CSV table of all heavy atoms in Angstrom, one decimal:
chain,number,residue,atom,x,y,z
A,1,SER,N,0.8,-1.2,0.0
A,1,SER,CA,0.0,-0.1,0.0
A,1,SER,C,0.9,1.3,0.0
A,1,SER,O,2.1,1.2,0.3
A,1,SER,CB,-0.9,0.1,1.2
A,1,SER,OG,-2.0,-1.0,1.0
A,2,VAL,N,0.3,2.4,-0.3
A,2,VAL,CA,0.9,3.7,-0.4
A,2,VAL,C,1.4,4.0,1.0
A,2,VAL,O,2.5,4.6,1.1
A,2,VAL,CB,0.1,4.7,-1.1
A,2,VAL,CG1,-1.1,5.0,-0.2
A,2,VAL,CG2,0.9,6.0,-1.3
A,3,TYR,N,0.7,3.8,2.0
A,3,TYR,CA,1.0,4.1,3.4
A,3,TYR,C,2.3,3.3,3.7
A,3,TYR,O,3.2,3.8,4.5
A,3,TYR,CB,-0.1,3.8,4.4
A,3,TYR,CG,-1.3,4.8,4.1
A,3,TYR,CD1,-2.6,4.2,4.3
A,3,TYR,CD2,-1.1,6.0,3.7
A,3,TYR,CE1,-3.7,4.9,4.1
A,3,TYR,CE2,-2.3,6.8,3.5
A,3,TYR,CZ,-3.5,6.3,3.7
A,3,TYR,OH,-4.6,7.0,3.5
A,4,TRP,N,2.4,2.1,3.3
A,4,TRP,CA,3.6,1.3,3.6
A,4,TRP,C,4.9,1.8,3.0
A,4,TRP,O,6.0,2.0,3.7
A,4,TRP,CB,3.3,-0.2,3.0
A,4,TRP,CG,4.7,-1.0,2.9
A,4,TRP,CD1,5.3,-1.3,1.7
A,4,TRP,CD2,5.5,-1.5,3.9
A,4,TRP,NE1,6.5,-2.0,2.0
A,4,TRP,CE2,6.6,-2.1,3.4
A,4,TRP,CE3,5.5,-1.3,5.4
A,4,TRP,CZ2,7.6,-2.6,4.1
A,4,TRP,CZ3,6.6,-1.9,6.0
A,4,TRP,CH2,7.6,-2.6,5.5
A,5,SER,N,4.8,2.1,1.7
A,5,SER,CA,6.0,2.9,1.1
A,5,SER,C,6.3,4.2,1.8
A,5,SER,O,7.5,4.5,2.0
A,5,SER,CB,5.7,3.1,-0.4
A,5,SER,OG,4.5,3.7,-0.6
A,6,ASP,N,5.3,4.9,2.1
A,6,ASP,CA,5.4,6.2,2.8
A,6,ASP,C,6.2,6.1,4.1
A,6,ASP,O,7.0,6.8,4.5
A,6,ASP,CB,4.1,6.9,3.0
A,6,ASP,CG,4.3,8.4,3.5
A,6,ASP,OD1,4.5,9.2,2.6
A,6,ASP,OD2,4.1,8.7,4.7
A,7,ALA,N,5.7,5.0,5.0
A,7,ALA,CA,6.3,4.7,6.2
A,7,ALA,C,7.8,4.2,6.1
A,7,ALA,O,8.6,4.7,6.8
A,7,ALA,CB,5.4,3.6,6.9
A,8,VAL,N,8.1,3.5,5.0
A,8,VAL,CA,9.4,3.0,4.8
A,8,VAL,C,10.3,4.1,4.4
A,8,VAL,O,11.4,4.3,5.0
A,8,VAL,CB,9.5,1.9,3.7
A,8,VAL,CG1,10.9,1.6,3.3
A,8,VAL,CG2,8.9,0.6,4.2
A,9,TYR,N,9.8,5.0,3.6
A,9,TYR,CA,10.7,6.3,3.3
A,9,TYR,C,10.9,7.1,4.5
A,9,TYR,O,12.0,7.6,4.7
A,9,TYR,CB,9.9,7.0,2.2
A,9,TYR,CG,10.4,8.5,2.1
A,9,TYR,CD1,11.6,8.7,1.4
A,9,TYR,CD2,9.7,9.6,2.5
A,9,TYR,CE1,12.1,10.1,1.2
A,9,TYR,CE2,10.2,10.8,2.4
A,9,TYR,CZ,11.3,11.0,1.7
A,9,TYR,OH,11.9,12.4,1.5
A,10,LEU,N,9.9,7.4,5.2
A,10,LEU,CA,10.0,8.3,6.4
A,10,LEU,C,11.0,7.6,7.5
A,10,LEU,O,11.8,8.3,8.1
A,10,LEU,CB,8.7,8.5,7.2
A,10,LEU,CG,8.0,9.7,6.5
A,10,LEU,CD1,6.6,9.6,6.8
A,10,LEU,CD2,8.6,11.0,7.0
A,11,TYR,N,10.8,6.3,7.6
A,11,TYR,CA,11.8,5.6,8.5
A,11,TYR,C,13.2,5.6,8.0
A,11,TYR,O,14.1,5.9,8.7
A,11,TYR,CB,11.4,4.1,8.6
A,11,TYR,CG,12.2,3.2,9.6
A,11,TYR,CD1,11.8,3.2,10.9
A,11,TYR,CD2,13.2,2.5,9.1
A,11,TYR,CE1,12.5,2.4,11.8
A,11,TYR,CE2,13.9,1.6,10.0
A,11,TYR,CZ,13.6,1.6,11.3
A,11,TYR,OH,14.2,0.8,12.3
A,12,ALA,N,13.4,5.5,6.7
A,12,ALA,CA,14.8,5.6,6.2
A,12,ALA,C,15.3,7.0,6.3
A,12,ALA,O,16.5,7.1,6.6
A,12,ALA,CB,14.8,5.3,4.7
A,13,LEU,N,14.5,8.1,6.1
A,13,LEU,CA,15.0,9.4,6.3
A,13,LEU,C,15.4,9.7,7.7
A,13,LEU,O,16.5,10.2,8.0
A,13,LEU,CB,14.0,10.5,5.7
A,13,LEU,CG,12.7,10.7,6.4
A,13,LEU,CD1,12.7,11.6,7.5
A,13,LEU,CD2,11.7,11.3,5.3
A,14,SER,N,14.6,9.2,8.6
A,14,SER,CA,14.9,9.4,10.2
A,14,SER,C,16.2,8.6,10.4
A,14,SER,O,17.0,9.3,11.2
A,14,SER,CB,13.8,8.9,11.0
A,14,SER,OG,14.1,9.0,12.4
A,15,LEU,N,16.4,7.5,10.0
A,15,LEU,CA,17.6,6.7,10.4
A,15,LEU,C,18.8,7.4,9.6
A,15,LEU,O,19.9,7.5,10.2
A,15,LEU,CB,17.5,5.3,10.0
A,15,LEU,CG,16.8,4.4,10.9
A,15,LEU,CD1,15.3,4.6,11.1
A,15,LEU,CD2,17.1,2.9,10.7
A,16,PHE,N,18.6,7.9,8.4
A,16,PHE,CA,19.8,8.6,7.6
A,16,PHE,C,20.2,10.0,8.3
A,16,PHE,O,21.4,10.2,8.4
A,16,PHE,CB,19.3,8.8,6.2
A,16,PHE,CG,20.4,9.6,5.4
A,16,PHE,CD1,21.6,9.2,5.1
A,16,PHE,CD2,20.0,11.0,5.2
A,16,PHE,CE1,22.4,10.0,4.4
A,16,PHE,CE2,20.9,11.8,4.5
A,16,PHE,CZ,22.1,11.3,4.1
A,17,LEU,N,19.2,10.7,8.8
A,17,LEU,CA,19.5,11.9,9.3
A,17,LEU,C,20.0,11.9,10.8
A,17,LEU,O,20.5,13.0,11.3
A,17,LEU,CB,18.2,12.9,9.3
A,17,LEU,CG,17.8,13.4,7.9
A,17,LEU,CD1,16.7,14.3,8.0
A,17,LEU,CD2,19.1,14.1,7.2
A,18,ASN,N,19.9,10.8,11.4
A,18,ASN,CA,20.4,10.6,12.8
A,18,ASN,C,21.7,9.8,13.0
A,18,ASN,O,21.9,9.0,13.9
A,18,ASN,CB,19.2,10.1,13.7
A,18,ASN,CG,19.6,10.2,15.2
A,18,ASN,OD1,20.5,10.7,15.7
A,18,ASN,ND2,18.6,9.7,16.0
A,19,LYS,N,22.6,10.0,12.0
A,19,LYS,CA,24.0,9.4,12.0
A,19,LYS,C,23.8,7.8,12.2
A,19,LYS,O,24.6,7.3,12.9
A,19,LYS,CB,24.7,9.9,13.2
A,19,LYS,CG,25.0,11.6,13.1
A,19,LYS,CD,25.3,12.0,11.8
A,19,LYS,CE,26.4,11.4,11.1
A,19,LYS,NZ,27.2,12.4,10.3
A,20,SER,N,22.8,7.2,11.6
A,20,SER,CA,22.6,5.7,11.6
A,20,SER,C,22.5,5.3,10.2
A,20,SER,O,21.5,5.2,9.6
A,20,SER,CB,21.4,5.4,12.4
A,20,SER,OG,20.2,6.0,12.0
A,21,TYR,N,23.7,5.1,9.5
A,21,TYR,CA,23.7,4.7,8.0
A,21,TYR,C,23.7,3.3,7.8
A,21,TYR,O,23.1,2.8,6.8
A,21,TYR,CB,25.0,5.4,7.5
A,21,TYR,CG,25.1,6.8,7.6
A,21,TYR,CD1,25.7,7.4,8.7
A,21,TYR,CD2,24.6,7.8,6.7
A,21,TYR,CE1,25.9,8.8,8.9
A,21,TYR,CE2,24.6,9.1,6.9
A,21,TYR,CZ,25.3,9.6,8.0
A,21,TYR,OH,25.4,11.0,8.2
A,22,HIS,N,24.4,2.5,8.6
A,22,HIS,CA,24.5,1.0,8.4
A,22,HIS,C,23.2,0.2,8.5
A,22,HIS,O,23.1,-0.9,8.1
A,22,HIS,CB,25.5,0.4,9.2
A,22,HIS,CG,26.9,0.9,9.0
A,22,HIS,ND1,27.5,1.9,9.8
A,22,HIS,CD2,27.9,0.8,8.1
A,22,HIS,CE1,28.7,2.2,9.4
A,22,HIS,NE2,28.9,1.5,8.3
A,23,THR,N,22.1,0.9,9.1
A,23,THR,CA,20.8,0.3,9.1
A,23,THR,C,19.9,0.9,8.0
A,23,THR,O,19.3,0.1,7.3
A,23,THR,CB,20.2,0.6,10.5
A,23,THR,OG1,20.1,2.1,10.6
A,23,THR,CG2,21.0,0.0,11.6
A,24,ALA,N,20.0,2.2,7.9
A,24,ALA,CA,19.1,2.8,6.7
A,24,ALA,C,19.6,2.3,5.5
A,24,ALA,O,18.7,2.3,4.5
A,24,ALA,CB,19.3,4.4,6.8
A,25,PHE,N,20.8,2.0,5.2
A,25,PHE,CA,21.4,1.4,4.0
A,25,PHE,C,20.5,0.2,3.6
A,25,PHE,O,19.9,0.2,2.6
A,25,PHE,CB,22.9,1.0,4.3
A,25,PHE,CG,23.6,0.5,3.0
A,25,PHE,CD1,23.4,1.3,1.8
A,25,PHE,CD2,24.3,-0.6,3.0
A,25,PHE,CE1,24.0,0.8,0.6
A,25,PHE,CE2,24.9,-1.1,1.8
A,25,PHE,CZ,24.8,-0.4,0.7
A,26,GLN,N,20.4,-0.8,4.5
A,26,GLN,CA,19.7,-2.1,4.1
A,26,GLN,C,18.2,-1.8,4.1
A,26,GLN,O,17.4,-2.4,3.2
A,26,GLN,CB,20.1,-3.2,5.0
A,26,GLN,CG,19.6,-3.0,6.5
A,26,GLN,CD,20.1,-4.1,7.4
A,26,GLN,OE1,19.9,-4.0,8.6
A,26,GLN,NE2,20.6,-5.1,6.8
């Protein structure tokens, strides 16, 4: 669903912007 992709994107941005790259990567 669109909400699933939206949630994945927001999660990835939050992990990327908080100095957590090795998790947001995968």
